[PDB]
Structure formats: structure tokens, C-alpha cells
Write a protein that binds this ligand. Structure first.
Ligand SMILES: CC(C)[C@H](NC(=O)N(C)Cc1ccccn1)C(=O)N[C@@H](Cc1ccccc1)[C@H](O)[C@H](O)[C@H](Cc1ccccc1)NC(=O)[C@@H](NC(=O)N(C)Cc1ccccn1)C(C)C
Lengths: 99, 99
């Protein structure tokens, strides 16, 4: 598919069995998702953004499915205001920027 | 061009006379550049992201060239970690996400 950028590029992702929407984000290095409790082992982390840093938990090897396309990687869960799909999972789904 | 996202998507921009690099950022509504003097008048604004809010100066109707493509649009200047080109100028240059 081709997403245009008139609206925020939101898509549905299936993660841990359930669907959520998430923003496709070429300027994020990592994927950050709203608070949820996944089974599994995690690590504390801090990630930063325009106004400062926030505390998150890192899960490794999570399968997500972004418009039919699976990807496996690291996800950070924390008190974020949006669910953000960053480049670590976007590379796996073959996604490009074209102008 | 077609840009893959294995590395951070950074381009050279020309603005005010300067060259700079900025990130092409689909997850950003607006464009935020590090502090500079730009010709023109400006209004204070706040913008936010992960971590909170910063104070930015707003300049409207600013010419900017991203990879040899011109846009003319609003640019916010403030103390951002990174120079970000957001969706307000990516649609002028005809950028899409494809996968
Ligand atoms: C730049 C700013 C105007 C932009 N804000 C924005 O678009 N807003 C607030 C409108 C809005 C409101 C509600 C929903 C959606 N959008 C923003 O920060 N967007 C975030 C997404 C977001 C939106 C709202 C709340 C919280 C998050 C978007 O993720 C940007 O890609 C942002 C850009 C950025 C990059 C580097 C440094 C600062 C800002 N990435 C990030 O914040 C990511 N950080 C990151 O990847 N970093 C810091 C690594 C890095 C370092 C240096 C250079 C590049 N990358 C994190 C989500 C992990």
C-alpha cells in the first residue's frame, strides 16, 4: 500500500492477539507502545524525545503484524501518548519513503 | 528518491541561506529546527512530544529546499534534539510511505 501524509499515518497492528492503532514513524528509531502487560521478561530503559526522557520497559522479540506484514523485534512499553512504530520494525516490513 | 529506513532518514535542507541536515519524519505533524536566526517575524508557541513540551519560535511562509525540492511553509525554531521535517512540508514535496 501507499500512505499519503495528509492525515497522520495511523494503521492497525495486531500485538499480543489484539488490535491497536499505531503511527508509522520514520523518525523514531524504536517502537513505543502504550501501557499493556505482556508476559515476558523486560529491561528498564529510558528513551527521549523532544521535551525530555521517559521511562519504559523493553521487551525483546515481540511479533507484531502491520497491515498483514509480520515483524519481530523490540518493543518499549510505557506511558506514551501515541503508539509509535519506528524504524526497527518498518525495515522488516519493506517500507520506504518516496518522493 | 526511494529511501529505506535502515539508517535514519536524513537529508540536506537549505534554508535562510544555510545548509543543514534534517530528518524526514512521518510521525511529526510539524517541522522543528534547531535554534537559528531566520529573517522574518515570529510568534511564541509550544510544541510537544515524548517528554513534554518545548517553546519554539514560529516563522510562517519560509522557503525551504529539501533535496532540491522546494516547500514554503511554517517552520518552528527551538531547542530540539534533532532537526525534523514533519508532515506539513512532506506533503508539498509529494512524499509517501510505501510498502
Ligand atoms: C517533533 C514533534 C513536533 C512531534 N509532535 C507531534 O507531531 N505532535 C505532538 C502532534 C501529535 C499529537 C498527538 C498524536 C500525534 N501527533 C513528535 O515529537 N512526534 C513524535 C510522536 C509523538 C507524538 C505525540 C506525543 C508523543 C510522541 C515522533 O515520534 C517523532 O518521530 C519524534 C522525532 C524526534 C526524533 C529525535 C529527537 C527528538 C524528536 N521521535 C521520537 O521522539 C523518538 N525518539 C527517537 O527516535 N530518538 C530520540 C532517536 C533519534 C535521535 C536523534 C535523531 C533521530 N532519532 C521516540 C518516539 C523514540
Amino acid at each position: 500500500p501507499q500512505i499519503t501524509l495528509w492525515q497522520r499515518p495511523l494503521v492497525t497492528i495486531k500485538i499480543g492477539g489484539q488490535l491497536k492503532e499505531a503511527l508509522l514513524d520514520t523518525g523514531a528509531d524504536d517502537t513505543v507502545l502504550e501501557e499493556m502487560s505482556l508476559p515476558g521478561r523486560w529491561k528498564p530503559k529510558m528513551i527521549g524525545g523532544i521535551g525530555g526522557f521517559i521511562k519504559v520497559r523493553q521487551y525483546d522479540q515481540i511479533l507484531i503484524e502491520i497491515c498483514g506484514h509480520k515483524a519481530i523485534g523490540t518493543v518499549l512499553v510505557g506511558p506514551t501518548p501515541a503508539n509509535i512504530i519506528g524504524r526497527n520494525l518498518l525495515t522488516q516490513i519493506g517500507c520506504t519513503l518516496n518522493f
